[PDB]
Amino acid sequence: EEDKIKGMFNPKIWDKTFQDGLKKEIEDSQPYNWGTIHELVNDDLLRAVRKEIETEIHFTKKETDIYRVNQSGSGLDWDDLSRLPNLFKLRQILYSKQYRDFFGYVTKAGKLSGSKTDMSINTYTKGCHLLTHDDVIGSRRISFILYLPDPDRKWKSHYGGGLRLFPSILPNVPHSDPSAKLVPQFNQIAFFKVLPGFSFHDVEEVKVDKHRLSIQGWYHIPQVGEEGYIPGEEEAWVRNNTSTLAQIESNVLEDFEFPKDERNILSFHEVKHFEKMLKVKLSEAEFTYLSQYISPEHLSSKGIEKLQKQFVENSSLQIESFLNDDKSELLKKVIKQKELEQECPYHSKDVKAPWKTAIPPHKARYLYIDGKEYRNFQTEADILEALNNNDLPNFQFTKDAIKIISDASGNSRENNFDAELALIDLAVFHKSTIFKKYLALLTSLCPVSEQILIRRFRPGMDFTLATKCRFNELLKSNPDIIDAVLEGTLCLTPSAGWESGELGGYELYMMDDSVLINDPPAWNTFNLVLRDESVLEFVKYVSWSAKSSRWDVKMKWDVKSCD
Amino acid sequence: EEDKIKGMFNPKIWDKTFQDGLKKEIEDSQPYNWGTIHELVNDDLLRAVRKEIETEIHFTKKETDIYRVNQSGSGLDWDDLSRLPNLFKLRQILYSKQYRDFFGYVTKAGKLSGSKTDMSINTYTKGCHLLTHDDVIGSRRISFILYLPDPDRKWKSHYGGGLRLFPSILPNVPHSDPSAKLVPQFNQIAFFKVLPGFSFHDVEEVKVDKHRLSIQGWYHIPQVGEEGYIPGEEEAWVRNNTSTLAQIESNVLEDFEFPKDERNILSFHEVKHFEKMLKVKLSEAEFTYLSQYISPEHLSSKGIEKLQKQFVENSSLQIESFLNDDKSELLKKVIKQKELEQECPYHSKDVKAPWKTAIPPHKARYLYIDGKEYRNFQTEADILEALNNNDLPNFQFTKDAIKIISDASGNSRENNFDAELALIDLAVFHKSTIFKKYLALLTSLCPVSEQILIRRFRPGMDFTLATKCRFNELLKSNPDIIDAVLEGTLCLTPSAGWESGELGGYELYMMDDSVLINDPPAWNTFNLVLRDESVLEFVKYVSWSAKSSRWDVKMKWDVKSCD
Ligand SMILES: [Fe+3]
Ligand SMILES: [Fe+3]
């Protein structure tokens, strides 16, 4: 009762002057309303809870596209906490009427469910992380995290594990870079009211070899019977954030994704060449042209049949030493040089031509070169300007634009476009008619469209999430054109240590064990995959631990059978 | 007989030493084998023939896409030449065995038909012309023209009317510029053996106010019964130059046309905007954006309904004062400035970025800006390089490339890109999402693809020939997408005197009287036409007489009904 529960918290939290001060502070916070309280719970109680958890619970590593976490979601039954009396106590006081009134008041959330408790316990160790998300699930009204690292030592900034908040360009379109970061200590709580479209946050990777324990939880909309229940409130809420969010997603939101998952159609000269060949396959002039980039191993009569058969068998190809030695060395030299001697931008504002940042961060983040005009999305107007003035990729005009920049600034070991120029030449090569003629030979498919990107995934920044291919809307009715996207990836990652996947950066292909391909970055490999609409793909978040970025060239084609 | 026929020609032509000398000369001629003979026929006979024709025959003007000629093809019956005994005589000696042996020998043509005579009589007056063609029809083996201008005065070079020969980049792909020109006198014959793919020639416009009379003719493959008849020769020949030329046309030759008649597909952001609107139509922000270029007359509530109704009625729009006053003046100023103070290239080699020359000349010739990388087709390799490395239009990257040229060379009244920059801004505007939203409103059609070109048709050079629209091959199966190309033309011709069509430059739309539209160049007009596959279009050859080039912006879209 009352006094027994209030005694388990810092006495300050029951003080009206403190409460008003805190409500004001949360009201003035940026980038959206959040709060923090130091030394929330009674020290002894919380020390005990930490002891119980270290002693009573096992934590297993779990990796998805969006997180690596040691969870207990093996020891933990929320309906039987008999062996963990201290935790049971914490859960009772955190959901008590006294605390729910306090918490609802300072966050301006209104009333909170007493019965519907929702907690999980996690540890973050080196490499653990949670990417950008907003917490909008079901009936959640407030998010909190209570932190329990070592009570007798300061958790430092460079340890990582910070709670990071994101400012917003529009509703549902957060900025790529965070504008606030909380470095939490023991017995500190962080919390915010859930804001569909705004409450974007993540957990910064833990960077050093330590264990950060925490209790994550949510307060829910009052349920039927409880204080502050309103009939139809929860269902209105859930409806709005689900079926109708999906409705706004297709109608509007996909427009604010960059790069767009769209392909440009090939000319009739190209398509005719492919067709004729499919219904003395390549000329000598053509092998000569191909041999400038491609290893003779894959251009030989037997290399081809081998690849043809693998593709017919698996609907996929994983080639090694794809490029020849002349190109492999040049690319390795210029890429290593850039990695070791030049500064990589670590903020979207610092990214310059020919590079761009993929957005938004709750879908993806990475640097890419698309051959389009320079774009740096810092405001709504920046975005609308692009959507009004869409342009087409021109890799040659990008080499040109590099020279105007290179000649008005000079060149040096610290600032040059050698890597960019080499990679664009690679891109031009893969856009040539003769390359696609070679692709058509390997696969017996006839490409009818293409998109090429050069991508760089920075350590500690960059990642995609699991998604399906996007069918060319306009072509869906053409029965000759296969219900599939052919997808290529040329990995050009020069550094070592990827093999176990612990550093991230792996390309993952899976069924909606369902894993079809799981390739950590390597040097000069080429994956070709013909995806149906059910196949999911992503590149995993690259860890701060990694010695270089993942560099690749990404290619997509719409295809038709010539029978 | 024999001696009576040989006496009607210059006695030199019967001389073996002359004959061998002439055969050698024809053998050494460029750009393909041709010959000429001064004073071929007996002077008196030819003077008489000239008198008969001036006295006995009327000549009527006839204009097509490819020529303006005063013909007799009213006086002239080849089966009854009783009132023209001298001409009958000429025709008998020109087709005589004696002359056919001589002519067949020097041209290395072999035997020639005696019975199958083929002649026509024409005069070229100011403005008369015949564009690039090769003479390959049916059974023709040798072309000749015999010239009968005024016998007692020199026909000068600047009079025009020269016979011009074209060098070849590949078989069937002549160079845009001629490499030989014959200025003919009275009693001179010009002639060549017919060469499928090579014998390209034209008649230079007559530039001054005079009358050039001539007799054009052909010698044919020997017919059944005649000397040198070979069964199946003629039919092999005809077959090869018809059905199988058409086969090579579709398989290969269209690849060497520039610009290509191809459109790039719009993004899903664009298509969705158009659809939503078609199934408080434009926002104020949108009218504001549109009003920067378009005259308020056409943006008003009633201007729109008016245009909507005209389009539903005719499947076409002809708008006047399309652009507003601010843009109309700027464009007129920069275009007039260029016309009056800068030098226009008059040879494909002299054409510089951002401009290109349409090719080949037996299909079209004009200058255009497509937003693609610079291309100057002087060799086979130039062409194959483009086909291997196709690129996509980027009008913004073309403004960029202009600055690298402009800043390494400086600007002046004699050399600047003001006109080009203004026209590209116009092009960017018409490629914007909001413009196409306006286009969709006028027409109730939803654009799904686009091509834009800025074109300049030089006086004395430039023209297109009557052609059909090209359906997007890839889309033909999509039943939502209309079997039509929407086609726009913004004329920006600043000079006067076009009204009667005598200067050329008119846009002609017709049925395969069949004329649907016939618009001489004017200032700031916009034509919109929805072409089915049967509609033919061309811009007429611009005369040397014209005071400026025809300047326009040309736009094409694939479209779908939203019902
Ligand atoms: Fe969260
Ligand atoms: Fe001719």
Q: What DSSP letter does each residue of B95-112 carry, written as one string?
A: SSHHHHHHHHHHTT----
Q: How far is CA A369 from the centre of its chain?
A: 18
A24, exposed or middle or buried, with CB in 10 Å at 0-12, 13-18, 19+?
exposed
Resolution of this model in Å is 2.7
- Determination approach: X-ray
Which runs of E-coded beta strand occur in A20-174? 34-37, 60-63, 67-71, 119-124, 129-133, 140-147, 163-165, 168-170, 173-174
Intra-chain end-to-end CA distance of chain B, in Å: 78
Q: Could you give the CA distance from residue B390 to residue A368 in angstroms, rounded to a whole number?
A: 22
Hey, which residues does A203 pair with through a beta bridge?
A: A130, A163
Q: Are strands A212-220 and A119-124 parallel, antiparallel or unpaired?
A: antiparallel
CB A169 within 8 A of CB A384: no
CB B112 within 8 A of CB B226: no
Give a three-class secondary structure readout of A99-141: HHHHHHHHCCCCCCCCCCCCEEEEEECCCCEEEEECCCCCCEE
Helix (H) or strand (E) holding A216: strand A212-220
Q: Could you give the CA distance from residue A162 to residue A167 in angstroms, rounded to a whole number?
A: 16
* Other beta carbons less than 10 A from residue B544's beta carbon: 19
CB B489 within 8 A of CB B552: yes
Return binding residues of A for Fe cation.
Answer: 133, 135, 201
Helix (H) or strand (E) holding B539: strand B536-539
Q: Could you give the CA distance from residue B530 to residue A394 in angstroms, rounded to a whole number?
A: 30
Chain A contacts in chain B segment 237-266 (CB below 8 A): 251, 254-255, 260, 262, 264-266
Q: Could you give the CA distance from residue A299 to residue A244 in angstroms, rounded to a whole number?
A: 52
Q: Could you give the CA distance from residue A155 to residue A183 in angstroms, rounded to a whole number?
A: 8
Q: Are strands A60-63 and A67-71 parallel, antiparallel or unpaired?
A: antiparallel
The residue type of B510 is M
Q: A396, A445, A438, A426: which is closest to A288 by C-alpha?
A: A438
Q: How far is CA A161 from the centre of its chain?
A: 17
A211–B contact, CB cutoff 8 A: no
Which runs of E-coded beta strand occur in B364-514? 364-365, 367-369, 445-447, 449-457, 463-464, 481-492, 507-510
Hey, which residues does B357 pair with through a beta bridge?
A: B367
Q: Which two tokens stand for residue B13?
A: 């032509």
Q: Could you give the CA distance from residue A507 to residue A536 in angstroms, rounded to a whole number?
A: 11
A268–B254 C-beta distance less than 8 A: yes
Indicate if the alpha-carbon torsion angle B375, B376, B377, B379 is positive or negative: negative
B478–A contact, CB cutoff 8 A: yes
Report CA-CA distances (Å) from A255 to A28, A466, A545, B265, B295.
Answer: 32, 19, 34, 16, 30
Chain B contacts in chain A segment 261-280 (CB below 8 A): 262, 264-272
CB B33 within 8 A of CB B192: yes
Chain A contacts in chain B segment 365-394 (CB below 8 A): 372-373, 387-394
Q: Which two tokens stand for residue B167?
A: 């060098």
Q: Could you give the CA distance from residue B440 to residue B433 in angstroms, rounded to a whole number?
A: 10
Q: Which two tokens stand for residue A536?
A: 């999911």
* Other beta carbons less than 10 A from residue B30's beta carbon: 10
The residue type of B141 is R
B401–A400 C-beta distance less than 8 A: yes
Angle, CA B527 vertex, CA B522 and CA B528 arms, to 5°: 175
CB B474 within 8 A of CB A272: no
| DSSP-assigned letters across all residues of B89-149 | HHHHHHSSHHHHHHHHHHTT-----SS---EEEEEE-TT-EEEEE----TTEEEEEEEE-S
DSSP B264: E
Angle between helix axes B433-443 and B268-278 (nearest 10 degrees) is 30
Coil, helix or strand for B68? strand
Hey, which residues does A192 pair with through a beta bridge?
A: A34, A143
φ and ψ at residue B3, rounded to 5 degrees: -65, -35
DSSP A11: G
Q: Could you give the CA distance from residue B433 to residue A387 in angstroms, rounded to a whole number?
A: 7
CB A199 within 8 A of CB A192: yes
Q: Could you give the CA distance from residue B128 to residue B70 in angstroms, rounded to a whole number?
A: 8
Report CA-CA distances (Å) from A134 to A117, A166, A194, A237.
Answer: 19, 10, 8, 15
B350–A contact, CB cutoff 8 A: no
The residue type of B203 is V
CB B259 within 8 A of CB B368: yes
* Other beta carbons less than 10 A from residue A55's beta carbon: 9
Q: A371, A378, A331: which is closest to A351 by C-alpha?
A: A378
Q: Could you give the CA distance from residue B294 to residue B366 in angstroms, rounded to a whole number?
A: 27
A272–B260 C-beta distance less than 8 A: no
CB B393 within 8 A of CB B264: yes
Residue with tokens 């850039």: A338
- Which ligand ends up closest to the CA of A120? 1
Angle between helix axes B301-314 and B433-443 (nearest 10 degrees) is 60
B473–A266 C-beta distance less than 8 A: no
Length of chain B: 563
Coil, helix or strand for B562? coil
Q: Which two tokens stand for residue A409?
A: 């600034």
B133, exposed or middle or buried, with CB in 10 Å at 0-12, 13-18, 19+?
middle
Residues of B in contact with A448 (CB under 8 A): 474
Residue with tokens 């890839």: B474
Report CA-CA distances (Å) from B183 to B49, B122, B141.
Answer: 21, 17, 24
**B511-537 core/surface letters (b: 16 or more CB in 10 A; e: else):** eeeeebbebbbbbbbbbbbbbeeebbb
Which runs of E-coded beta strand occur in A302-363? 316-319, 356-357
Going along chain B from its start, the domains and CATH numbers come out as 1-247 (2.60.120.620), 248-563 (3.60.130.20)
* Other beta carbons less than 10 A from residue A68's beta carbon: 23
CB A463 within 8 A of CB A367: no
Report CA-CA distances (Å) from B547 to A35, A243, B123, B336.
Answer: 76, 65, 25, 11
Hey, which residues does B201 pair with through a beta bridge?
A: B133, B165
CB B266 within 8 A of CB B449: yes
Name A28's Cβ contacts closer than 8 Å, sequence gap at least 6.
none
Q: Could you give the CA distance from residue B520 to residue B495 in angstroms, rounded to a whole number?
A: 11
Q: After which residues are there C–N gaps above 2.5 Å in chain A?
A: 73, 279, 512
Length of chain A: 563
- Which ligand ends up closest to the CA of A66? 1
Residues of A in contact with B477 (CB under 8 A): 477-480
Q: Which two tokens stand for residue A315?
A: 């609907």
Q: Could you give the CA distance from residue B202 to residue B129 in angstroms, rounded to a whole number?
A: 8
Q: Could you give the CA distance from residue B176 to residue B147 in angstroms, rounded to a whole number?
A: 26
Which among B251, B270, B391 is the nearest to A394, CB-wise?
B391
Which runs of E-coded beta strand occur in A371-519? 445-447, 449-457, 463-464, 481-492, 507-510, 515-519
Angle between helix axes A433-443 and A418-431 (nearest 10 degrees) is 60
Q: Could you give the CA distance from residue B427 to residue B398 in angstroms, rounded to a whole number?
A: 11
* Other beta carbons less than 10 A from residue A194's beta carbon: 23
Angle, CA A267 vertex, CA A266 and CA A272 arms, to 5°: 100
B305, exposed or middle or buried, with CB in 10 Å at 0-12, 13-18, 19+?
exposed
Q: A397, A435, A434: which is closest to A528 by C-alpha?
A: A435
Coil, helix or strand for B551? strand
Q: Could you give the CA distance from residue A308 to residue A252 in angstroms, rounded to a whole number?
A: 41
Name B131's Cβ contacts closer than 8 Å, sequence gap at least 6.
B65, B66, B67, B202, B361, B362, B463, B465, B541
Residues of B in contact with A432 (CB under 8 A): 388-389
Q: Could you give the CA distance from residue A273 to residue B255 in angstroms, rounded to a whole number?
A: 11
Report CA-CA distances (Å) from B119 to A511, B87, B422, B560.
Answer: 76, 11, 51, 51
Backbone angle region of B2, left / alpha / beta, with phi > 0 → left and psi within -120 to 50 → alpha = left
CA of A420 to the centre of ligand 2 (A): 54
Interface test with A, best of B249, B251, B269 (most A CBs within 10 A): B269
Residues of B in contact with A392 (CB under 8 A): 264, 392-394
Q: Could you give the CA distance from residue A33 to residue A40 in angstroms, rounded to a whole number?
A: 19
Q: Could you give the CA distance from residue B444 to residue B298 in angstroms, rounded to a whole number?
A: 16
Angle between helix axes A433-443 and A301-314 (nearest 10 degrees) is 60
Report CA-CA distances (Å) from B161 to A139, B155, B549.
Answer: 87, 9, 21
Q: Could you give the CA distance from residue A510 to residue A287 in angstroms, rounded to a whole number?
A: 35
DSSP B9: B
Q: How far is B520 from chain A (nearest CA, A)?
A: 32
* Other beta carbons less than 10 A from residue B14's beta carbon: 14
Report CA-CA distances (Å) from B44 to A424, B8, B49.
Answer: 74, 9, 9
Angle between helix axes A418-431 and A325-341 (nearest 10 degrees) is 140
Across the beta sheet with A507-510, the strand order is A515-519, A507-510, A536-539
CB B520 within 8 A of CB B489: no
Residue with tokens 């922000």: B285
A471–B contact, CB cutoff 8 A: no
- The reply to whether omega before B354 is within 30° of 0 (cis) is yes
